[model samples]
Target: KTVRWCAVSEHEATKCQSFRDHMKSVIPSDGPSVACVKKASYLDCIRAIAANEADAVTLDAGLVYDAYLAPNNLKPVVAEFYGSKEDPQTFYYAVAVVKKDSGFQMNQLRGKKSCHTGLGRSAGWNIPIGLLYCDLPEPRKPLEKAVANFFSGSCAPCADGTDFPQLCQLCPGCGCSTLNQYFGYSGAFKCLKDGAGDVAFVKHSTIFENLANKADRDQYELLCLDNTRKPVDEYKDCHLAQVPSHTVVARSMGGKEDLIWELLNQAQEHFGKDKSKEFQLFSSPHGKDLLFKDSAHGFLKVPPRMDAKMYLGYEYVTAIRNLREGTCPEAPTDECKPVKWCALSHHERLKCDEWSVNSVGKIECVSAETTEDCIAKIMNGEADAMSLDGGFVYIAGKCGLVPVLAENYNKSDNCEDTPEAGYFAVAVVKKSASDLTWDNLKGKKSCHTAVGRTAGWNIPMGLLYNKINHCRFDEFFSEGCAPGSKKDSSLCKLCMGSGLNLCEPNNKEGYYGYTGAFRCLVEKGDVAFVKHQTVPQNTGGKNPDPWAKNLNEKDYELLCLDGTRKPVEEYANCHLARAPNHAVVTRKDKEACVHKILRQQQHLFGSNVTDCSGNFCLFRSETKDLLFRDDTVCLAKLHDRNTYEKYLGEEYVKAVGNLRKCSTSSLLEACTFRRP
Candidate 1:
């Protein structure tokens, strides 16, 4: 069988041909035969495969994602596995190493000199930069500028001098082209070794390979996100995270995946490591790692099953997408396609407008009236994506929209790391009300988030409905205000309408949102249902509003489902449920567009993202949140092609579905029409 291999460059094609020729020379008849399908670039090669003009090619994780998009059905056939033979791995660790003597912890990376393999490579670029994203400051500049400031200087290959002069200042060559002496794993470590940089971003095996002397290698350390430092060998126990290794991809139509695997597998048999130095399938005299990682022990047959996304783990894929978007504006035009983001109402419109301006043409902001409106827009081709509260997330899932990115909250122990397990749902009440507990909640004046929010109503109501075996939550609490409850209904009777809104979904109604629900308890109600942080954010002068400014944490307590009261800090042990966070959702087929735009938007409008000159802040400090949660740390990823029921967990989905029977609103009643 004849298999054509598409290469990004003529040099790559030549190298691949050498290997193919050698294979043919060995097994004359049943030999691994591959034809070099010369193409202009990797992008062109992907298109070639889609058109049935080419059979196979090796691809970067970023391009692999694009290849998985429309008009193509490319799947990975082989993965260059890394790590030692004893502990062979299908991935590598993206490391940030510094001189052990630098003595400064990870937090002190600011104002230091830095080095990177290139602008968009995974191990050397995406992972390390994405880790530092949350630690950056205002100055909505490109990642290069922010990092350039964080570091006194940097030697990032391919960085443009005009846009980010400081970052390219250390580049030994002209700032324009990528062929600076420092452009890959070896180059980055070399920068660090020569004292040109204090820290180097590279793959795990880079220092071991480059720093030949054991003594020299011993002088280097890896920087952990926890701000801790460890010897280079500690990477296995203390890495940022596992990243997918590079893959050999082929067209799903006529790509001959079977033949491609035969070539790589047989090539590995003859040329893996020092076994036969004469003919090497993966080696280079030019040095460092090339088409394949130089240190790679052998190739693993990618389960003919894995697509580009499946082969590259979710987090690794997400990091690469962010890198592409983060570095987009550094050039004349980002290679990424435009993505449409949805915004609901005036506040959302204003924030989204600023975001659109800041995106530099990465995402186009679309307007809608509510989350459900955004979902409808997603289905009708009007909009592509937006973030929604958990309850609305339920509605979106049922409406055929899939969640792509989740809002991750920071760890309370230390803000250094990212989102932990999930948020805690709890019941809030005044601490002095000692007699108040879950057992005696009947006849108590209660406050809910709205009619069907996760913490506010869904989870607790789901439990209540199952506990009492009915939906008469109105009678459980003598006179309570559940905002957005059927207007003129018993649930709205106790509502203190803002004279303008009668139990409406907007803040125009006093008892409407998280803050409003807490306000209901602060004034007229006895118990409030909300996420644990709600009290810390709205009480004790935390919220400088007319009512919350005087509230105190010592005066409040959380009512446990077991009829006990505890301090707010004990939410972990005494809470309602481990609820999922709000997430950005899109049509199942439009995932690529949504992921691209969200990655781009975060680089421009993220909490820490700001122009070097402070031209604009995406979140609009006046408004804590417009589209996503204000406390969102990063966008946590879900499994590739994960459905709503799979992502939210069957239990949470079932609970929420049952709670829907007792709740309805202008915005949520439409959920009834959702496809069963």
Candidate 2:
């Protein structure tokens, strides 16, 4: 049988040797047996078990607790190694040391660099940083500044031109060479000898050994006393004695649990014998008890378990980096193909001189913007597909339009596996539309539905902020001006400095204004606003526009010429026309169309496409932002309605705050005007 185990680099090889020797002693000489041991840092060993790289590992109790609280795939088996009495728990023995001749008090060395093993290593690092920072009487300014300097290299100037004192410096004796100078464990004992670092940390036992090796044992002395006002207890003439316990963890998958238990039992037998006098086992709290238990030990309490969700965040970051680096798999371009269709009014068709050249070969009208209309068109075989809102797509499938693809699709592989997935959305503006970029819309006249309106508007906009903006609504708002009559002058100053022309309310010439009717602005040619299907139709009419009372249903006609949607050139001139296949819908019978649409969508949008690819017709939302010259767009003309009431709501005000705090660059670009 093969057994895998993890141990610290200091003890891994010896433990493996001992285990092998024990196996030989217990079983027949010819019995099947082998051992594979991996040497890792205590933290690394725990991580290996959590990641399933090893069957089990040895780690400190604190390390186990930290792993439990973090997001990892591991669990502990068996309490502390077999030992006797009194809860058998072990506590790390912490020590601080300086050179024999350095004449420095514990207070003087407060801001100086010291080194320990690693962050989570109980006796080596965490305990020391905590004891110095959390337990001390004087303010932790020195330690705080020291830590900051270590990471940022922003040390204060010293007349002596020496290296800035570090809060925590790694020792050369600890084996962390790459990180030694900053904060590492390797060569720590040597650094203390050379007087390079102000302080060195090690278990009390290691400190005692250093004293014994000295030709003049009395040259150095302990720097401080514990609560008992005597030399700290972990140290004796040449050794440190404290409860010795290590971590035990297993892979997330449940298979090795029994194996882990059996190994612990075996390890207990091994620890009982005094093979190595350097370490000993102690009783440990059960893993189950440890997980559910809360301690009043303040920050010293054991860390909790590692949740898988945290790893998802890391995965998302990795995926984005891969995408940016062009390492994602190339989109599939075979087996499926794209088909185009157009919807336009007969009157608009007369304007197209070359109908065949500009028209999609297939055409039909499902302008009702309702699921029933979309389904009826597919059933009548007049149109093979149409795009529906992701929400309406579900409703359409129920009514039978068959969802084939999602517009502005994002699969979320690019997003960190976070709880914020539902908030992801993208605005589907024309790539060639210059005036409607994200920047120009800030503090200006733009349109949106209410907060809970999921038809496409709000969720997509929220997603846009979450993804491209890298912040949540609350965080964004907190960065903006404070709400109230006073208005945050700082926020206003920032806006003004960024070149926003925030004139006083009396000066109506500025860009900032509110608006209620998105379509009214679009129709009146005052401001270009985004509108959903059917809304644009009311505004497109010439005189005494119809459908004044009905807000839900309206027949909107797309401008066309000679039985074809207006050509790009003509449409560009008029700034109005239906875009073909920009939105697609699936039919119940045409599975190929659905696949083709989804495949093409995957190519256009990238792999993080949402999961709604295999349904019915893809119907395009009539909602498109109107494009116009910046100077020509007017916000005041559209501001006199209940539309601004929601803006007055607490949520909208908060949203504004969030938008203000976003990266000036992102916000600038999002709110700037550019020609397509």
Candidate 3:
């Protein structure tokens, strides 16, 4: 019996032939034999295997996804294991290598020269694109076109057949062929080594493979997701992603998986690593990763049940799937459909327009007068999605909407994977109010961010509901300003706004958002019900608004739940409750579409994204808390907390539910009554 192995290039074929020649010496005449089948490229080898021209071939984890599709119907039967003998790993990290002296972070990669192994490769293209290219200015266009626009020049082999000529502009020869000087892992590293590329996207072992000495390897660094750089060996902490290793594939139907495993197992037992002096099973003379990675320690049989998607893992598969074309809706109207975001204010509308202009029609802005109005529009199918506060999220859920993603403020590097831990609701008072603790605030004037907001209303009001024996906060406080209160109500007595927008629950109300509510305490009210970060954010000159131009952080204190008072810094321990962070809510039908668009949208405009001159930052607002909170670092996935009740949690949801017993919301009433 003979097992045919497909080789992509001439060098690999030569190595395969040597492997075949060595296998003959060890195996008996009637036993398993090795045969080499040469092909033009990896894809060709895959096609050949599918056509039964070859029995098996080693393919990158990325290409396995493509090979598993119809016509090619292949499955990974074995995985190449690399790293130390103590811990053999079946995965390797995709890293961005740059010269140590380059002195730039990951955020500053725009317009820089980059090198890659080949089109659709994991370490070279898909991982880097999924992490970095989501922010491309022309997002609606092809990924290749957008990537070409992102970098000034690149040497990505096999990226030919694309209309964008700029993609291969930096190549030295026929850019699509392996004969080109810059083709594979080593070739891409050489591109950076020769100073032709600002950065090289390659596997973690690439630098060690290309450079012989440890001192020479120290000349390069890995770009980290946190916009910093670390040593070349520190890839575990600084990689774009950790992906499955190269896998050997064959036809799933009547495939020779068992035969191929037996052949490789026997060959590795004899010639693997330091097994034989005659021929090395994992190494080649003139090329790297000929049949398998030169750094591979051994091979492991992949479970027979593991298909391409399962073997690659859900995370890696999602990253690769993001790079696939046709992200936009099917082009029926000769134009790509854009995601419609409901904007609550004129300033928010302006920022949304700026986002729209830069997004190249990926998203469009729709105007609404208030949060309730925005919710109504989204429910009516007039808009796709928008960020909603916890109270508004409840209203959204009542209207058949779901939470897609949450606004993260933890300043994390991997915002996409970060869990929505939510934020704290605190009661802030002036430091001078030592006598006015949480116990004796019955008749004291209060300031709230808004009437139905989480910290400002639900959490604080729910605590006082049983004690006050009434649902109306106006009876508890002598005269407080709670945005969304009736204009003639005593709750609107402390409001500072233009006559037309008095007590309106928006930035139009002078004492409106987190900063606005804090400003009300600074200028008028006794205590402000706002988020924990509100005091520090508006004070200490962090806020540039005229009212808070010179406020001091030392002047604020927090009211503890135990009837004690502490400085604002003690909010973590003294807060009233942990409320859900603002989340992007969408109709059930638009869940997947909204999630995809928002994920891409935030990468371009997130707070930590590179400070490219003249770009729109999504989390920022001309006023405060426009479309999303001003302090938001990034918009992170909900991690399956899709429903409003699930995202808000039982305690907070119960708190909100209790608050609803006192006063009714017109929006909630409208949604509850208008059905059927």
Candidate 4:
């Protein structure tokens, strides 16, 4: 049986004619008469594979790879052209050509109008386009801009009889150069002769003879823009030569695998010989070999994998470079520190300066070195309030610090499992000042306690930054500041450490006032400090310390600015399982005072019990009965109607009535256990 085959058309005859000529040379003349062979465009060849109308189809490597990814039966078996023997896999080469006498460098031609074929077309387009975009510096944009300008107010129609490649036509004014078309090689030669375009793109083989002649005559100069110095005797007159490979594919149908392999092997044998002219197939045997080998046969396999980190790193590097060049904003001051704590503080201080402060009143500032110091003052009675890192707050709550509110702070997860959490230093006032709301503190002196660290300062400062900037903390630091010195003191700007700022002292009163530990600063008093919630419990134990008076939990009042604190019953969601009412205990001698305080508390809050006699409530008859029977029936009856109803149902009443009727004296003992 004859094998049906299809192939793509070239500059000469259609692929069908070439296939017929090659098949006739190999198979019996009577085997297959090239039956129903129809000419097809390169796109039609791919379509035929999808439709399963062809047993075999010849295509470019890129097209085969695309088909493999798509719903198609075509599989690449061999590359028609191979450039290297050491690496048998085929590759596409991009070449740049210019008028022999034109004074043009690769950079100068960036925005000039150039031509190539479609992305999928191997030799006609992909090779050159990829070379230009991937090989050249600042390729895509400059080329796009150049094309737009060139095409603006078109001067002539495309000499190659095809529209300009999309990249070349991106700009409005760019016209398709005749030399950059699919069938424009002849036109390109003509244009070069007539000085139409400054440059043109063509395959190495098409211009090899002319280039070789020029090289031998020392009339033309040729150079390759790629890093590899692959000799280009093939195109000496051309500015660039991209090594390209052609591909052969077979249909993926059941029971045809062996036959397809046999055909491919035969074709390889035919093309393997150097003298064979059935098709012009010659490649560098030393550099690479091209054949259908293992999983390497696909076109997509050629390009390198994209590394996300690397890509982002490159982008960052570019951004930094641009900043250095003054093409973009200077690096933010925050970028220099581990965190943007100082920046956050600066922001809040600005807001305070703007909204709260009277024309003459001076704003007081507090600075701490760490989050622990900030929390200490807040938990103790020394400071009125303080901002603590959000995560540290959760930790501090577990450690005994009362959490009043979630301060808007800067936090980042850094693409990790746990998000980065921290708070900005607002202020720390005495417990007596619990009545003061954030609004009350608006005009009050506010300052960032620390800068540089995440939990200690960056978080709170970030919140302040966001508030004043009217944007997110990340954006404020990432974009708002000058590239370099603008945010030097901020913790969030730098990338090396936890995107939090560590405390750094700029001066005694500036954003960086605190130089020691956060807790130590808070202990100094006079200044409110920002801290983390995870500060140690006994920071100011019963010892000689400035915060000793306020260290006792009883001395501090965790008040709400808005009086919107939820009931104890709602504490479960806030990390409390049961009501968190304070337990009051008094010395034996102070019983009277304890009682007075208890009565005041009950009146102020609410009572859980009433009607007390002496030290406790009176025991009624129901309680006595419970004690005698050692049963909770009386207690149960006091609360449960269902239990009483079950005991006093109609059945029980009827039984009792019958029992009384059967009694001899018409008087029966009352039911011992009566349901009320």
In terms of TM-score, which candidate is strongest? 1
The alpha-carbon lDDT assigned to residue 607 of candidate 2 equals 31
> lDDT by residue for model 4 over 113-158, one digit each (tens)?
4443332343434344433343333323433333334332112223
> How many residue pairs collide in each prediction?
6, 78, 0, 72
| Residue 388 displacement in candidate 3 (angstroms) | 28
Ranking by TM-score: 1, 3, 4, 2
RMSD of each: 16.5, 25.9, 19.1, 33.4
Clashes of 3: 0
> What digit string (tens of lDDT, one per residue) describes model 1 on residues 323-393?
55543334333354566789877877777777677777666888876666677677655777788766677
Per-residue lDDT value at 306 in model 4:
13
Q: Per-residue error at 222 for model 1, in Å? A: 2.2
Candidate 4 Cα misplacement greater than 4 A, ranges: 1-53, 60-62, 81-93, 98-108, 111-183, 186-198, 211-246, 251-258, 264-676
Each prediction's whole-model lDDT (CA): 0.72, 0.35, 0.81, 0.33
